């Protein structure tokens, strides 16, 4: 904990559900943002940490709280971005084992988000700190001393602090996107590479230059796009549109009406036509004539 491992995470497609899954990973609570929202949000320069926690002291070092471990091993501001992920390293630390000495006796409190690489023996008394730990002066690191006995009390926890740099730079780490699969010759909404739209999609015979990925017409609408999944190229045509017209002989001269669908193919229109689908649109049995 005294020299905790600051890490940088970049160019990452990272799913955080797996971390939530493990029963030892009982703690993934985040001071920063909701874990469910986290799986969707994108961040950059993600900071991950490596440290050994007894769990008896984690409350003291928990963000928003300060303890002698927090005052010396790792100071952390009350607001904490990202999550504190703690899982039991009860066995690996038990047997015993005392290597991971962590700073508990240092002269002054350290600044938040700071790692103290060098060990500073506590300058407590006026008498000089010569001879490392001694009278009026105490060694900072305490042997973490995890045994089978210390497996139960002060339970060993393998804990990582995840504090994402909140996409100050372009976000380089986040989770899965773009799940839906494509269909052709159907009026469907599309979000191809995040480009929202609605239309009927068909394979585009027109070529694309290798750098060119999306096609714009004279109207600047989208007419072709290279598929994000495959190099196959899709023409996008807007879904069928038209205005309706009603022919009537007059209300007094019967109530039968004739509906004309202007500028649309007769095969294209079912009775489902969607916009204005309230009308039954009569039926195919009713005489349907395709006119200019």
């Amino acid at each position: 904990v005294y020299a905790w491992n600051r890490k940088r995470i970049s160019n990452c497609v990272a799913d955080y559900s797996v971390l939530y899954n493990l029963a030892p990973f009982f703690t993934f609570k985040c001071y920063g943002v909701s874990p469910t929202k986290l799986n969707d949000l994108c961040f950059t320069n993600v900071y991950a940490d490596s440290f050994v926690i007894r769990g008896d002291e984690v409350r003291q070092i928990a963000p928003g709280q300060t303890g002698n471990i927090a005052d010396y091993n790792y100071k952390l501001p009350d607001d904490f971005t990202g999550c504190v992920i703690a899982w039991n390293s009860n066995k690996l630390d038990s047997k015993g084992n005392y290597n991971y000495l962590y700073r508990l006796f240092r002269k002054s409190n350290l600044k938040p988000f700071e790692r103290d690489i060098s060990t500073e023996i506590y300058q407590a008394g006026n008498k000089p700190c010569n001879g490392v730990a001694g009278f009026n002066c105490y060694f900072p690191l305490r042997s973490y001393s995890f045994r089978p006995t210390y497996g139960v009390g002060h339970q060993p926890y393998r804990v990582v602090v995840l504090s994402f740099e909140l996409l100050h730079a372009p976000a380089t780490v986040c989770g899965p996107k773009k799940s839906t699969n494509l269909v052709k010759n159907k009026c469907v909404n599309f979000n191809f590479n995040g480009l929202k739209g609605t239309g009927v999609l068909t394979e585009s015979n027109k070529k694309f230059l290798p750098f060119q990925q999306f096609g714009r017409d004279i109207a600047d609408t989208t007419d072709a796009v290279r598929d994000p999944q495959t190099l196959e190229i899709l023409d996008i045509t807007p879904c069928s549109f038209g205005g309706v017209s009603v022919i009537t002989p007059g209300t007094n001269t019967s109530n039968q009406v004739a509906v004309l669908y202007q500028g649309v193919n007769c095969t294209e229109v079912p009775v489902a036509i969607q916009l204005t689908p309230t009308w039954r649109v009569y039926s195919t049995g009713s005489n349907v004539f395709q006119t200019r």
């Epitope: 690996l92 038990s94 047997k95 084992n97 139960v152």
Partner: antibody
Framework: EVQLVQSGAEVKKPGESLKISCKGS????????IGWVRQMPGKGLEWMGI????????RYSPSFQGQVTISADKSISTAYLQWSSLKASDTAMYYC???????????WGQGTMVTVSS | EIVLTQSPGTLSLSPGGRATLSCRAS???????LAWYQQKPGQAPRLLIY???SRATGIPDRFSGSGSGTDFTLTISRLEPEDFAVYYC?????????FGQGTKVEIKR
């Protein structure tokens, strides 16, 4: 208390799968790491790997990974080491010495002087 | 992993004298803190000393951990009947621990 009694020395016809038994007692299997070690007759012991006994997860020795099949049950507190199939070359002294990556001695088994011969 | 052999195979000597067990490591491993094993004669071995130079838990003051790197030289100030038995230098930090050649103490055939 933490004492480990292994299987007794047994005359064994070469070519059958036998689960040697190492009793565990007075310890939490997750809290106390168990290892596995065997001594062939008359020279230093050989590592069989270390088991995570709370999960009964034995990572066998690279020399003996797949060579022998090691199993143990935390609830029954008694190992069942299939040893793949016991062969005439497998004749050796087997010691149920608890230990992890630190490879400490902890408590050994009483000793398994299995002579795999007809 | 690291080959461990403690010179000699048998240090034939009178009891009560100071002796050292020079374990030879093919690769120098001070990070191993190797777990010295003292094989009880015809019994389940007891870890001689763990930590290479650190002493074993509950080991007598005569048994002193010493040696590091490619050569671990475990110093025993006074030989006893327990000392008159096979030893082993076994890797502690290093995985696939390797047992030593062994050492023994004796005076007469």
């Amino acid at each position: 208390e933490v004492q480990l009694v292994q299987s007794g020395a047994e005359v064994k016809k070469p070519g059958e799968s036998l689960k040697i038994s190492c009793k565990g007692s007075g310890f939490s299997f997750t809290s106390y790491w168990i290892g596995w070690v065997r001594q062939m007759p008359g020279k230093g012991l050989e590592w069989m790997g270390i088991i995570y006994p709370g999960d009964s997860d034995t990572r066998y020795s690279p020399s003996f990974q797949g060579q022998v099949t090691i199993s143990a049950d935390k609830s029954i507190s008694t190992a069942y080491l299939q040893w793949s199939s016991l062969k005439a070359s497998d004749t050796a002294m087997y010691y149920c010495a608890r230990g992890g990556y630190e490879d400490v001695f902890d408590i050994w088994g009483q000793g398994t002087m299995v002579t795999v011969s007809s | 992993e690291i080959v461990l052999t403690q010179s000699p195979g048998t240090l034939s000597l009178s009891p009560g004298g100071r002796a050292t067990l020079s374990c030879r490591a093919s690769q120098s491993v001070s990070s191993s803190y190797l777990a010295w094993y003292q094989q009880k004669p015809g019994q389940a071995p007891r870890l001689l000393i763990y930590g290479a130079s650190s002493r074993a838990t509950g080991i007598p003051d005569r048994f002193s951990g010493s040696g590091s790197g490619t050569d671990f030289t475990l110093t025993i100030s006074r030989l006893e009947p327990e000392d008159f038995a096979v030893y082993y230098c076994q890797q502690y930090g290093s995985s696939p621990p390797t047992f030593g050649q062994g050492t023994k103490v004796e005076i007469k055939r």
